[PDB]
């Protein structure tokens, strides 16, 4: 699968390692949440990152299904 990644600047797409067939988007608040919104992390995954109390997680299985909130999927 191919996923968006926040490891690069600008955000780009990477082909995930074999066995990692999901894309993920993780978002959470830091000190700047009120003005900048939540922190955004995008990457690859074999297993969806566990759901943490004060964290939002989205995991999907189609190419580039995990875009930055400011971008459309695909």
């Amino acid at each position: 699968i191919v996923c968006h990644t926040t490891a690069t600047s600008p955000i780009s797409a990477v082909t995930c390692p074999p066995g990692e067939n999901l894309c993920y988007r993780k978002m959470w608040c830091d000190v700047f949440c009120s003005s900048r919104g939540k922190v955004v992390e995008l990457g690859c995954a074999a297993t969806c990152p566990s759901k943490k109390p004060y964290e939002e997680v989205t995991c999907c299985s189609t190419d580039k299904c995990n875009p930055h909130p400011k971008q459309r999927p695909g």
Binding site: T6, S9, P10, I11, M27, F32, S35, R36, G37, K38, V39, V40, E41, H68, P69, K70, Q71
Partner: peptide, 13 residues
């Protein structure tokens, strides 16, 4: 760098 939902441009740190 770190990204926030408010911009496609990354912030320092």
């Amino acid at each position: 760098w770190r990204y926030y939902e408010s911009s496609l441009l990354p912030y320092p740190d």
